[PDB]
Each structure stands twice: as structure tokens, then as C-alpha cells.
Design a protein around this ligand. Structure first.
Ligand SMILES: CC(C)(COP(=O)(O)OP(=O)(O)OC[C@H]1O[C@@H](n2cnc3c(N)ncnc32)[C@H](O)[C@@H]1OP(=O)(O)O)[C@@H](O)C(=O)NCCC(=O)NCCS
Ligand SMILES: Nc1ncnc2c1ncn2[C@@H]1O[C@H](COP(=O)(O)OP(=O)(O)O)[C@@H](O)[C@H]1O
Length: 197
């Protein structure tokens, strides 16, 4: 099934762009969003996390208290391995369930890392480094110090652009951005049909 890899540095707007493709009928696969769904209120994985570390891991609205989980993980690196063993298999299953359950002409695979050989096409969401730094501050509420260092750990802008088949500058007017997404959608639709034959 035709697959487009969506990638881009932190704060470039991957989620907003993927959400626009989603409103066009495209199946989006994002393990970051699936990981938060397998521990949503009432799920077995959240119960297990609470059974293990205590009810304080569940906040007033029945959702995971990620502050206390971070602290626990930070104080006991052994719990990260158990958390992985718990969640990783649930993310794999829910990833395949969404693939197998897709009737869309093509599939959008959100992948922050770059896994460039697994997809039929690579779409890079790009913005200037400064824009990356600010949009991180207001989206996550973190500090810039932490933002610069998160950005240092990732691939460089030139690296992403060099591996891209298509690029979308998530800057300027949203309408223009959404229009560019629609044009790419039409392109990918055609590449999917071509591939089918
Ligand atoms: C908030 C109050 C009315 C009830 O406290 P509580 O029953 O412990 O409520 P919660 O479990 O939702 O609060 C857990 C704490 O972690 C925070 N928290 C909860 N879920 C979180 C998450 N996913 N990420 C980060 N922080 C989170 C809450 O803001 C709260 O901090 P706070 O106590 O300084 O307000 C009261 O006790 C209080 O602390 N004031
Ligand atoms: N064209 C734009 N102008 C202003 N803010 C934007 C634009 N596009 C995206 N954003 C904002 O940037 C923030 C981070 O984007 P996000 O989708 O989280 O990127 P990523 O998923 O790559 O981290 C979001 O809060 C979003 O509202």
C-alpha cells in the first residue's frame, strides 16, 4: 500500500500538517499519538501503570500523570525497560490494526526519525531553526535552553531536505499551507494509482 513518510524537526508543524491530510481522508499513522492512546483513561495499560506505581499516577480527570511518571522513571531507570515492554507491543498492534483497516488510496506515516527506505515517498515539513525554537516553547511550555538541546540531538535541516522527495515550508498563511497540502494530496493520489498498476 502506497506510503508517504512525513518527517520534520520538533516544532515544524508535523502534527498540523498530518491533521490536514487526515481531513482529506488519508490514514495517518503516528506512533507518538498511538502511545498516548494506549495509556488513555480506562485502558488496561494505565491500570497496570497505576497498579505498579500507585493511584497517584492517575490525575483528577483519569489520565496519566506524566510528571510523576517522569520522576519515577528518572529515579529508577529500571522502570523505563518495564514501561517499554508494556507499551511497545501495544503500539505495534494498534499500528497494524490501523494499516489493515485502511481503505484510503495511500497512507501517511508520521516518523520523527529518519527509516527513509520503508516508504514510497518522503515528505519533509520545514521551517527556520528560530521558528523551531519558539514554536517549541509555546506548544510544550518548556524552556528555550531545553529547546536548543532537543534540536541539537536531531538531524540537521540540510539532512532532512536532502532526503526529502517533497518539501512544505510550514510558514506564512495557513490557507496557502493547506492549499499546498491539497496539491500534494492530489500528487500522492496519482502516484498510488500508478503504483497499483
Ligand atoms: C489539585 C488538587 C485540587 C487535587 O490534587 P490531586 O488530587 O493530586 O490532583 P491531580 O492528581 O490532578 O494533581 C497532580 C499534580 O500533578 C500535575 N499533573 C497531573 N497530571 C499531569 C500530567 N499529565 N503532566 C504534568 N503534570 C500533571 C497536576 O497539575 C498536579 O500538580 P499540582 O498538585 O501542583 O496542581 C489539590 O490537591 C492541590 O494540589 N491543589
Ligand atoms: N503556520 C503556522 N503559524 C503559526 N503557528 C503554527 C503554524 N503551523 C504550526 N504552528 C504551531 O506550531 C506548534 C508546534 O507544531 P507541531 O504540529 O507540534 O509540530 P511537531 O508535530 O513537528 O512538533 C503548534 O502549536 C502549532 O499550532
Amino acid at each position: 500500500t502506497y506510503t508517504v513518510a512525513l518527517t520534520g524537526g520538533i516544532g515544524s508543524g508535523k502534527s498540523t500538517v498530518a491533521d490536514e491530510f487526515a481531513h482529506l481522508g488519508v490514514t495517518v499513522i503516528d506512533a507518538d499519538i498511538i502511545a498516548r492512546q494506549v495509556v488513555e483513561p480506562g485502558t488496561p495499560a494505565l491500570l497496570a501503570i497505576a497498579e505498579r506505581f500507585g493511584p497517584q499516577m492517575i490525575n483528577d480527570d483519569g489520565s496519566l500523570n506524566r510528571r510523576r511518571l517522569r520522576e519515577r522513571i528518572f529515579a529508577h531507570s529500571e522502570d523505563k525497560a518495564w514501561l517499554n515492554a508494556l507499551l511497545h507491543p501495544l503500539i505495534q498492534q494498534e499500528t497494524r490494526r490501523q494499516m489493515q483497516a485502511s481503505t484510503s488510496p495511500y497512507l501517511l506515516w508520521v516518523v520523527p526519525l529518519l527509516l527513509t527506505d520503508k516508504a514510497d515517498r518522503i515528505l519533509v515539513v520545514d521551517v527556520p531553526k528560530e521558528t523551531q525554537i519558539e514554536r517549541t516553547i509555546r506548544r510544550d511550555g518548556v524552556s528555550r535552553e531545553h529547546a536548543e538541546h532537543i534540536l541539537a540531538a536531531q538531524a540537521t535541516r540540510e539532512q532532512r531536505l536532502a532526503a526529502a522527495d517533497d518539501v512544505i515550508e510550514n510558514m506564512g498563511s495557513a490557507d496557502a499551507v493547506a492549499s499546498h497540502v491539497a496539491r500534494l494530496h492530489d500528487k500522492y493520489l496519482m502516484l498510488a494509482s500508478q503504483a497499483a498498476s
